[PDB]
Design a protein around this ligand. Structure first.
Ligand SMILES: CCCCCCCCCCCCCCCCCC(=O)OC[C@H](COP(=O)(O)OCCN)OC(=O)CCCCCCCCCCCCCCCCC
Lengths: 68, 57
């Protein structure tokens, strides 16, 4: 079921009367990026790997010696 | 006041007929059998999909 593209997913569930290919231009989303459809990759090497998008809150000193 | 047996409209033979021949049980079986000839409700997920609304979360 995750292979069904968004829009068609809504139509198949009787969300909208008119199908995506029949939807006028004014009611389509404008994108400034390329559109790519990807299904559920769970149980597969392509499964989502989560991570922290922040570097650590406290930064340590870079140790530097000085001569007396 | 609850009525006694002697003040019953139905004769004992009609009551015994209902008792031994399971009249209401047969009515129930017939009601079940009528369903057997009606359209079922099942949909073939994931080839078909149940209703979804714009507010769905
Ligand atoms: C009029 C003169 C008659 C002369 C004599 C009669 C000749 C024999 C008649 C043949 C049938 C006799 C066998 C059935 C008698 C059932 C009597 C009965 O109702 O049993 C009741 C019993 C509880 O006992 P009781 O105290 O007497 O009830 C008072 C409740 N306040 O509680 C019970 O056991 C409930 C009844 C049991 C029903 C069993 C159901 C299992 C499957 C049902 C089969 C239906 C047919 C299936 C085939 C599909 C249809 C094509």
């Amino acid at each position: 079921m995750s292979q069904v593209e968004p829009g068609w997913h809504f139509w198949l569930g009787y969300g909208v009367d008119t199908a995506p290919c029949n939807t006028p231009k004014e009611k389509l989303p404008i994108r400034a990026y390329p559109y790519k459809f990807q299904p559920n990759y769970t149980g597969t090497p392509g499964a989502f790997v989560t991570y922290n998008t922040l570097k650590p809150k406290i930064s340590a000193w870079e140790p530097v010696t000085k001569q007396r | 006041r609850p009525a006694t047996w002697e003040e019953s409209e139905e004769g004992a033979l009609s009551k015994a007929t209902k008792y031994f021949l399971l009249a209401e049980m047969f009515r129930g079986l017939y009601v079940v059998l009528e369903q057997f000839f009606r359209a079922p409700y099942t949909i073939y997920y994931p080839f078909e999909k149940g209703p979804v609304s714009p507010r769905f979360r």
